[PDB]
Design a protein around this nucleic acid. Structure first.
Lengths: 1089, 218, 246
RNA sequence: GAAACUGCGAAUGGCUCAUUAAAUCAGUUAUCGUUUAUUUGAUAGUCAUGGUAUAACUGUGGUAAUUCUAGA
RNA sequence: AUUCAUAAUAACUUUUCGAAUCGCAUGGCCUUGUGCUGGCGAUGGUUCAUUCAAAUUUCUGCCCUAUCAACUUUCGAUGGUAGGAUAGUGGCCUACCAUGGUUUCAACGGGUAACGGGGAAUAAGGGUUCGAUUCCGGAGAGGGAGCCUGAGAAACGGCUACCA
């Protein structure tokens, strides 16, 4: 959308590209009182004094100084011709826009004055000019573009005759700029040379156009040049406002003959075709008619050659171009069709036939349709079915008022054995569109039907390729018009025997056989084998075809009473995502209930209506009203177990149906009849929780690969013809690769039953709304907790919300393991998870937590955090935690403090928060602080090394493990700095992970290459901080506890990477390892090292 | 009085004129937010449950919650309150207003339908009006259709089919809050510009340091 | 007034602006910018009342939307843009430059200026300070804030600044026997070389200046603006060379 | 492009001198004792992008009445 | 002239900022990802400086009135110390302290159909008398009292109460 409705202001923004799109060239489509055209002393001098008035640019003023000293008259022009031109080109390549407008104007009038002798200057003037155009492209001036191309059209108008004598060389001078990859540059140069083309005479036209054809085949790669020649000849015919002219039809004659030459490029033929299309779109038929006459003339001339394909191509474009609104005579075209057909005595034939069936008049079609269909039946025999498919998608009602089915039957009688895979490919496709009742009515060849029946008789089935052939012959065998039931029977029980576990292909093909049934024991056998063949729509369609064909008699009533589980299995079928298969199951179950008895209820009928409602925002309130209505009816009415299972699995189908007002309706509905049946729905919701993370594989049968595809038509540029050829070529690709297209369209008609990922969250919302039954069993959801999923965070959060909404929380299945996982996720960094963990932990009722409920709540809060810390985490103060209450609530405090340490110090605020955490750490108690250290070491591990000695179990140098390592050594540094003299060290909680971390840093330095810059940077930082806290803890504790146990191990981690080159590495400034060594060589007990 | 009854689920609403006084005596001494029994009102609302949502007095003065008095009152109203639309920024004018305690002086009492009873109401429960506007934000439409994160929305855009004479047409809103490659280019320029400025500042600082070091060496 | 005013009377204008009493009741109140109020010039009064190229606000407004003129390379689209003394005015379609500089008549004065002279501009450093993170910097008389200058420079110092980079071309100190322009006062515009400076601790320091006719006068340091050396101006000077006569 | 939300203005202009006798005003200060929306010039490495809404609008209303409004 | 500019330390904050914005166009790449980079301008944003400001603050200057000589200090009048408040200094206010301060060189209080000035008239000058009134400054918008928003109002073609 451009700017169509002009606003009132005087000043639009008018971007450069819009300026380009609006710009045109031709001064003859313009005009003015030109000063050079107005005063007739000299044109160059008139323009020069005019621009000496106008321009004030230093480039032009120096130029004007030189030239106003040089020339003052036309003999002075004729004398100093060269020097003034060299100064012109000097300033031209001096490149000043302010001078570029007037200098281009003086260039134009300088040529207008110097005409016939200018060409020697004019050639390198072309060179410097197109250089200046490239300079403007580097620049961004629509004004400069306009000036340059106006000057170009000027020089063309001035020097026309010599250039129309020497035309093809002038084309060559601009070809690199015509083939330049800018559409608007090509467009402007096309307008200028298009003026020249409309000027040029016929001999030079044919010569130049033929040379353009050879230049096209030379640059066959380039498309911008191709479209440039398109718009060139297009504008050459277009030039006026609405009407092409006699010079335009002369050009049409020249191009038509030069392209109807046998050596002409078919790419140029398509170029001509698009030129014709554009001219037909532009001009009116009153201007167009003599061109049509010259066209028919040249067709009747060069109608007999080897380029019948070429004339067919251009005629296809002529028929397609717009309609009969520009076509004078479909009868003249009909005559040319007869001529071309007699001269031929394929693909484009089919396309032209279809476009004629669409586009022509019915008063011509009532006579030529017989000749057309006999032509098609004779010549394009294998292409007849492709053509008839395209014609039925193009204009079916034309042929249906006419005799499509009759000629189709004649084609089937004449040939049915050659492309019978294409025959099904037609007759499979016609089933979906319900505008084809004539086609589903039409008859078939009798030899063909009986041969399909005899192949069915002699059929071996024990291969999926045999399944393919049987299903193929069935989908042909639809319209058998014979009693085929007892012939279906033995093959049917043969499938049911040979395949216990069917393919989806097996179910689909046997359901097609159920469709092949037209007009008992088949019903008996399908009631035997439906348990295997449940979930497939083609099965359900043929089954419902059977049931609707049948009539409710009493022997069938006896048999249906004998068969008990049909309707419960159909409820299990109602539990499916596909609304189509759920409604097919609906109407099937209704018809089966009619055959059985008369218990057909309002709930079933109404929910059929609900599935029949389409989904719009206007129908959204209607649908939700309907869901509330049927849920209220189900809650009010007394229920069988059958109808309860029905209603529940149908509501869960509506859960799968993917629509928000429906989700609101079912969330309104289900919490009132989960009381009615809270047992089956426990399996339904739990299945959704196990829904998609389990695999969903839909492995179908795949045929062998067939490479059938061709560029059956030329490449177009007009986008509507492009769409048409794309459609025809797609249908041709299918019809060539008839095999896999039968396969894929079967899947396209099979239908989806894959569940959304969101259905797990929907079950989580159901579990929120219904906590008691989740509180009842708990045994199947306990594995999800104790496996820790990976589920989504919102899934985990709404699960934790269900955990808080649980009532009998201590008497759940594994209460203490739940408490363990609760404590872990409380220590987790995500504060929302910490909140929900404390909600479940306070659902856990113990009087000390009921005491300090709001205390830990405001501890969880952010803006009361440090104040709460200074208030009741302070020793010997008000609200200080008592002895036994401290003993019993201590791990919770360490978990929340672990999270509030696990926050990253992104700013001074979070930095100060972490600082206050570690700074209130020194006051609690020795084993509690050591337990915080135990949790910090517990987020890490050392049992690898210490189940070994010093060997890595698995080479896990991962970013996650080393970021937990660097967080650990960072809080180690901070705790060292804030509890230098007083803190307790534990070899299991403090010592082993630290040497574990420095050894990990050395291993991720050595074992990997230097290409992991971030891993090696974090390796350097980890070694830095580890040796830092090493020397820190060494100076901080000294001799306060023993050192002999870990002595050899820490000496090993000293002597492995460092003592080889500690003198070479640590000499610039004293390293922490040097300080460690000096504390060793100073403290007498550390002299062993 | 006029009981403007509104079912928000259907988005339906109607009025019901009341002449007798006994359901009004059921109504008496209450206020906004409090609930009532439709059977205690009358027969047709059997089992129905409502809640007081508002009213206007016999002079037109609306009820307003917060004030616990069954009369009118001149409250110095401020910007972000009901019953008031300031024509200027920060405008706070005192206005007379009927209070929240239910009096008989109500020309209109307006009730919302909380719980449906048994019998269908013609204006409210029988039919509905679907909503005027679907959401405009991209994640909003994602939540609405349950659109996956991989799924685009421009294929799921709600389009209104309008018709002007014969030129049938459609309407579709601008998808606000939509990530584009143009947004990616914007972010890219932001990052590149910040890094470029950092390099330029570092270079100018190093050069000026070189200058002053030379000057001090002189 | 309960705030600032958007309004400027005819007679409320500074006298040097040379604007008549009769073609308006109002003068265009200049917007805020580099220079202060009375020693500036709006661009519309510059163009219409001196260059005469436009005659109406709609005209000069259309020109500003036409994006022609760049002051120190930067275009303004403000009509009442406060153009002050020693300014570079760049005219693209007419291909000119202009130094705005005081008149011998005490007025302002346009100067026809070439591109090389327009490439730089002059500035009286008025305050050198040390900014945050210990960064040294200066602010000029025209409000140019320049980080990291030459340390030898002090306050009130003349500096040649290339406008094209906005960078310190070079500087000129404050010595006796330097060529000085006088910006304000009764004797403003009278270019002369400084005799000396009578300095007062905390007081308005007076300055003795002798010009080419060996004429001596005394102004204040605020009016004092050093140009260059003796016979060495860094700029081109207009006719009269800032010399008062009878 | 109505409306509506958002932005800014609406602390100038125009009118009058009631009041006010070191008060203003004037000249002359100075703020190293203050803030400054705005102009201008510099100035910041330290998720393929959440959510809440509400107007405008649709729909039911009040009154004698206002640039009144209520419910949804 | 400075506890200044500026730098360092240790913490602090119902913890501020460090772009989840937009328009025009669309290039360069290349692992052919719909992956990577890239222009123009538009808004916003921390700090500093500017500009426009405003708020305080010094010297010097008022008409008549002694049948107006003492005046101010409970209730701040004068000075001190501490706090508050402010955008800040400050009795501005509060406490706790000292008894001050002005005046016949006229304090004080009273009169002023007294808005201040540039300017206007007049004489030869000295002077005299005006100046609501085109510019500037300040004040006000029936008058008492008070307030919101906003950088800016004690606004009044804003709001609250009184009286009329």
């Amino acid at each position: 959308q451009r700017q169509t409705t002009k606003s009132s202001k005087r000043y639009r923004y008018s971007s450069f590209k819009a300026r380009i799109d609006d710009l045109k060239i031709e001064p003859a489509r313009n005009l003015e009182k030109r000063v050079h055209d107005y005063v007739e002393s000299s044109h160059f001098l008139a323009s020069f004094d005019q621009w000496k008035e106008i321009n004030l640019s230093a480039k032009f003023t120096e130029f004007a100084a030189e030239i106003e000293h040089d020339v003052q008259t036309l003999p002075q022009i004729l004398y100093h011709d060269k020097k003034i031109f060299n100064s012109l080109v000097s300033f031209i390549n001096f490149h000043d826009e302010f001078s570029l407008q007037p200098l281009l104007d003086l260039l134009a009038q300088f040529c207008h004055d110097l005409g016939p002798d200018f060409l020697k200057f004019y050639e390198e003037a072309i060179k410097t000019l197109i250089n200046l155009l490239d300079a403007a492209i580097e620049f961004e001036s629509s004004n400069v573009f306009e000036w340059g191309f106006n000057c170009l059209a000027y020089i063309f108008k001035y020097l026309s005759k010599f250039l129309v004598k020497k035309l093809v060389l002038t084309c060559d001078l601009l070809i690199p700029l015509l083939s330049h990859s800018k559409e608007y540059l090509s467009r402007f140069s096309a307008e200028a040379l298009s003026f020249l083309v409309r000027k040029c005479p016929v001999s030079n036209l044919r010569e130049f156009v033929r040379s353009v054809f050879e230049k096209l085949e030379g640059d066959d790669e380039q498309t911008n040049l191709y479209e440039g020649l398109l718009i060139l000849f297009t504008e050459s015919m277009t030039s006026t406002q609405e009407t092409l002219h006699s010079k335009a039809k002369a050009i049409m004659s020249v191009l038509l003959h030069e392209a109807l030459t046998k050596s002409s490029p078919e790419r140029s033929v398509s170029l001509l075709s698009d030129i014709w299309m554009n001219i037909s779109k532009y001009a009116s038929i009153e201007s167009l008619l003599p061109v049509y006459e010259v066209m028919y003339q040249d067709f009747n001339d060069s109608l007999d050659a080897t380029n019948i394909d070429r004339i067919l191509k251009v005629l296809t474009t002529i028929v397609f171009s717009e309609s009969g609104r520009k076509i004078p005579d479909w009868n003249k075209i009909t005559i040319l069709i007869e001529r071309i057909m007699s001269q031929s005595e394929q693909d484009k034939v089919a396309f032209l036939f279809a476009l004629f069936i669409r586009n022509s008049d019915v008063k011509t079609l009532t006579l030529f349709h017989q000749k057309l269909f006999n032509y098609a039946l004779t010549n394009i025999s294998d292409c007849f079915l492709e053509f008839f498919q395209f014609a039925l998608r193009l204009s079916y009602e034309r042929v249906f008022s006419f005799n499509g089915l009759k000629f189709l039957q004649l084609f089937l009688k004449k040939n049915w054995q050659s492309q019978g895979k294409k025959i099904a490919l037609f007759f499979l496709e016609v089933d979906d569109k319900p505008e084809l009742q004539k086609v589903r009515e039409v008859n078939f060849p009798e030899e063909f039907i009986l041969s399909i029946r005899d192949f069915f008789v002699t059929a071996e089935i024990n291969d999926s390729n045999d399944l393919f052939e049987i299903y193929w012959r069935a989908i042909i065998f639809k319209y058998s018009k014979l009693q085929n039931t007892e012939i279906i029977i033995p093959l049917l029980e043969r499938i049911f025997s040979t395949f216990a576990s069917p393919d989806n292909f097996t179910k689909d093909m046997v359901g097609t056989l159920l469709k092949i049934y037209r007009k008992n024991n088949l019903l008996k056998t399908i009631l035997d084998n439906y348990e295997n063949y449940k979930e497939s729509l083609n099965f359900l369609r043929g089954w419902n075809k059977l049931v609707s064909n049948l009539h409710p008699s009493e022997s069938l009533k006896g048999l249906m009473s004998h068969y008990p589980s049909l309707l419960l299995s159909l409820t299990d079928n109602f539990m499916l995502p596909d609304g189509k298969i759920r409604y097919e199951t609906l109407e099937l179950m209704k018809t089966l209930m009619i055959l059985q008895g008369m218990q057909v209820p309002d709930l079933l009928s109404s929910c059929m209506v609900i599935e029949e409602i389409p989904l719009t925002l206007q129908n959204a309130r209607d649908l939700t009203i309907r869901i509330k209505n049927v849920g209220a009816e189900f809650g009010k009415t007394k229920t069988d177990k059958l109808v309860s299972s029905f209603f529940l699995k149908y509501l869960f189908g509506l859960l799968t149906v993917r629509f928000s007002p429906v989700w609101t309706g079912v969330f309104d509905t289900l919490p009132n009849v989960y009381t009615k049946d809270e047992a089956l729905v426990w399996k339904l919701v739990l299945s959704f929780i196990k829904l998609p993370d389990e695999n969903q594989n839909l492995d179908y049968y795949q045929p062998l690969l067939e490479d059938g595809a061709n560029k059956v038509l030329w490449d177009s540029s007009v986008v509507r013809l492009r769409d048409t050829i794309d459609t025809f070529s797609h249908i041709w690709s299918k019809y060539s690769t008839q095999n896999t297209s039968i396969i894929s369209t079967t899947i396209e008609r099979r239908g989806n039953t894959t569940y959304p990922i969101l259905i797990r969250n929907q079950a989580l919302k159901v579990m929120l709304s219904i906590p008691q039954v989740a509180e009842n069993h708990f045994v199947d959801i306990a594995p999800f907790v104790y496996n820790d999923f990976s589920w989504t965070e919102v899934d985990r959060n709404v699960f934790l919300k269900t955990l808080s909404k649980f009532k009998n929380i201590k008497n759940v299945y594994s209460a203490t393991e739940l408490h363990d996982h609760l404590m872990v996720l409380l220590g987790s960094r995500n504060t929302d998870v910490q909140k929900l963990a404390l909600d479940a932990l306070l659902a856990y009722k113990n009087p000390t937590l009921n005491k300090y409920r709001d205390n830990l709540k405001n501890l969880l809060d952010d803006t009361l955090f440090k104040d709460e810390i200074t208030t009741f985490l302070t020793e010997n103060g008000s609200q200080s935690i008592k002895a036994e209450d401290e003993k019993v609530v201590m791990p919770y405090v360490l978990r929340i403090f672990f999270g509030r340490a696990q926050v990253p110090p992104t700013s001074g605020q979070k930095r100060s928060r972490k600082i206050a955490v570690i700074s209130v750490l020194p006051n609690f108690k020795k084993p509690y602080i050591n337990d915080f250290l135990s949790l910090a070491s517990e987020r890490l591990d050392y049992n690898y090394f210490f189940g070994n000695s010093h060997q890595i179990n698995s080479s896990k140098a991962t970013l996650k493990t080393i970021r937990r390592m660097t967080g650990f050594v960072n809080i180690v540094n901070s705790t060292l700095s804030v509890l230098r003299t007083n803190f307790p060290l534990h070899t299991n909680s403090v010592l082993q992970p630290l040497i574990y971390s420095i050894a990990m840093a050395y291993y991720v330095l050595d074992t990997e290459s230097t290409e992991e810059v971030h891993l090696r940077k974090m390796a350097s930082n980890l070694r830095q901080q580890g040796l830092k806290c090493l020397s820190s803890v060494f100076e901080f504790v000294g001799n306060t506890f023993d050192w002999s146990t870990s002595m050899e191990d820490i000496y090993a981690v000293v002597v492995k990477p460092r003592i080889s080159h500690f003198s070479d590495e640590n000499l610039q400034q004293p390293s922490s390892l040097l300080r460690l060594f000096l504390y060793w060589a100073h403290n007498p007990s550390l002299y062993q090292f | 009085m006029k009981l403007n009854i509104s079912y928000p689920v259907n988005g339906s609403q109607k009025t019901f004129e009341i002449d007798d006084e006994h359901r009004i005596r059921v109504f008496f001494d209450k206020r906004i937010g409090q609930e009532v029994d439709g059977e205690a009102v009358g027969d047709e609302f059997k089992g129905y449950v409502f809640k007081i949502s508002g009213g206007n007095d016999k002079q037109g003065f609306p009820m307003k919650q917060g004030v616990l008095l069954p009369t009118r009152i001149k409250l110095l109203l401020t910007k972000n309150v009901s019953c008031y639309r300031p024509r200027r920024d920060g405008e706070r004018k005192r206005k007379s207003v009927r209070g929240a305690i239910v009096g008989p002086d109500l020309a209109v009492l307006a009730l919302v339908i909380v719980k449906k009873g048994e019998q269908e109401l013609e204006g409210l429960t029988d039919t509905t009006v679907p909503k005027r506007l679907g959401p405009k934000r991209a994640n909003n439409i994602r939540k609405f259709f349950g659109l996956s994160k991989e799924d685009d929305v421009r294929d799921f855009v709600i389009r209104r089919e309008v018709t002007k004479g014969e030129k049938t047409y459609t309407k579709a809103p601008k998808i606000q809050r939509l990530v584009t490659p143009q947004r990616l280019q914007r972010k890219r320029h932001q990052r590149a510009l910040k890094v470029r400025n950092a390099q330029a500042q570092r270079e100018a600082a190093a050069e000026y340091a070189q200058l002053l070091a030379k000057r001090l060496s002189e | 007034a309960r705030g600032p005013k958007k309004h400027l009377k005819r007679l409320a204008a500074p006298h040097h602006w040379l604007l008549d009493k009769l073609s308006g009741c109002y003068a265009p109140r200049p917007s805020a910018g580099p220079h202060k109020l009375r020693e500036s010039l709006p661009l519309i009064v510059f163009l219409r009342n001196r260059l005469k190229y436009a005659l109406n606000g709609r005209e000069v407004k259309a020109i500003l939307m036409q994006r022609h003129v760049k002051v120190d390379g930067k275009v303004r689209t403000d009509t009442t843009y406060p153009a002050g003394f020693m300014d570079v005015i760049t005219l693209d379609a007419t291909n000119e430059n202009f130094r705005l500089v005081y008149d011998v008549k005490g007025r302002f004065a346009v100067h026809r200026i070439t591109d090389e002279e327009a490439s730089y501009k002059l500035g009286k450093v008025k305050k050198v300070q040390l900014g945050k993170k210990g960064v040294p910097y200066v602010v000029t008389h025209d409000g140019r804030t320049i980080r990291y200058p030459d340390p030898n420079i002090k306050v009130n110092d003349t500096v040649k600044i290339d406008l094209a980079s906005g960078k310190i071309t070079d500087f000129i100190k404050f010595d006796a026997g330097k060529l000085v322009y006088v910006t304000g006062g009764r004797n403003l515009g009278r270019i002369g070389t400084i005799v000396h400076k009578e300095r007062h601790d905390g007081g308005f320091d007076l300055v003795h200046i002798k010009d080419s006719l060996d004429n001596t006068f005394v102004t204040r340091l605020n009016n004092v603006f050093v140009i260059g050396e003796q016979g060495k101006p860094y700029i081109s000077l207009p006719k009269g060379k800032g010399i008062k006569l009878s």
